[PDB]
DNA sequence: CTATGAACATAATGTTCATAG
DNA sequence: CTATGAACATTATGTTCATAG
């Protein structure tokens, strides 16, 4: 893949993985949390990208689905996420550190030569 | 609705590099490619030739640069297409955009790198 | 070989519609 | 309305081929 910058889905997948570590999340939650979290910097990911990233982590057997009901005040069906293979997660999280690390390096090298 | 505001595209990354190298040297596709291929090899980014040739032809169609069909040799006789500035303000302006781009891009990586690890 | 470029190919990610609380 | 998707569309890019020096 010509060794360029970290793909978007990898960038999300990383975020899902970490947020599963702390809370229980589903698609539209993570999206809105991210949408907010970045708004300033200016990155505004779409929903279908999130749902793609998620289903990969499924097919990769890192995570698994549960069809629960998060009420609050209503009675809505919502697909929540938990770890299937948490070693698998740990491993991928480490790869993504490496990825981000290069990604930083490139940006900082470009940013150094050209300006 | 945007290009969702994520990381800098590859072609921008190259276009940037062409623009700066034109400032300093005369360059053509295969030269810039090999220079970049080397320059990054450690970090691990190995761009291909057709990506380079795309980036170049944009800068053309954008009227930043223009072709110069010459024969830089040494011990040969061989056509290479060097580029020079067509509209150098146009360049300056784009280079500034790309600073902005790179600046966000850093911000994102550093933010992701902060939260998740 | 180097070099350029078209043509073809698919990968990554955006947009719209279907369908269920 | 939210939430999940699937379907459809396009752009951003990798792979290979036709030329020529």
């Amino acid at each position: 893949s010509t060794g360029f910058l970290v793909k978007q889905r990898a960038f999300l997948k990383l975020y899902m993985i970490t947020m599963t570590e702390q809370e229980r999340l589903y698609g539209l939650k993570l999206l809105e949390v991210l949408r907010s979290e970045f708004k300033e910097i200016g990155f505004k990911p779409n929903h279908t990208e999130v749902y793609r990233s998620l289903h990969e982590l499924l097919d990769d057997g890192i995570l698994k689905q549960i069809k629960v009901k998060k009420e609050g005040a209503k009675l809505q069906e919502v697909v929540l996420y938990q770890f299937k293979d948490y070693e698998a997660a740990k491993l991928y999280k480490k790869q993504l550190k490496v990825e981000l690390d290069r990604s930083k390096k490139l940006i900082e090298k470009a940013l150094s030569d050209n300006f």
Side-chain angles (χ1 to χ4, degrees), chain A:
Chain A
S1 76
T2 56
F4 197 64
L5 290 165
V6 64
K7 301 282 107 194
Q8 215 201 120
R9 38 103 171 216
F11 188 96
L12 306 167
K13 283 196 269 180
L14 182 53
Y15 272 92
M16 283 99 158
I17 283 152
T18 331
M19 260 144 207
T20 305
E21 283 171 344
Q22 299 156 162
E23 204 58 30
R24 217 174 225 200
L25 291 201
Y26 58 93
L28 259 285
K29 179 62 133 34
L30 169 89
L31 173 65
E32 282 315 322
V33 187
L34 292 182
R35 272 195 176 172
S36 157
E37 214 172 326
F38 288 102
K39 196 185 190 188
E40 212 170 57
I41 264 92
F43 158 55
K44 36 200 174 168
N46 73 61
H47 71 289
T48 137
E49 197 51 2
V50 166
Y51 282 134
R52 268 197 274 259
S53 320
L54 255 32
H55 301 145
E56 295 178 354
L57 287 168
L58 282 193
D59 302 333
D60 296 348
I62 284 89
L63 303 171
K64 67 189 309 292
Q65 290 174 307
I66 322 285
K67 268 169 173 292
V68 297
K69 297 190 161 294
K70 182 159 281 182
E71 293 202 43
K74 336 95 189 184
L75 200 54
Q76 62 193 176
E77 276 161 52
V78 154
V79 198
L80 273 171
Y81 281 84
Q82 67 177 328
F83 286 115
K84 201 167 201 284
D85 184 351
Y86 182 68
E87 299 195 328
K90 256 138 66 62
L91 229 45
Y92 188 52
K93 191 144 184 259
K94 292 187 173 164
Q95 303 184 203
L96 289 163
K97 174 71 163 96
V98 152
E99 280 261 73
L100 290 195
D101 274 346
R102 269 171 25 89
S103 269
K104 181 172 124 97
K105 233 173 257 280
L106 282 167
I107 279 22
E108 279 184 337
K109 182 163 181 322
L111 227 250
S112 177
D113 312 331
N114 297 63
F115 307 105

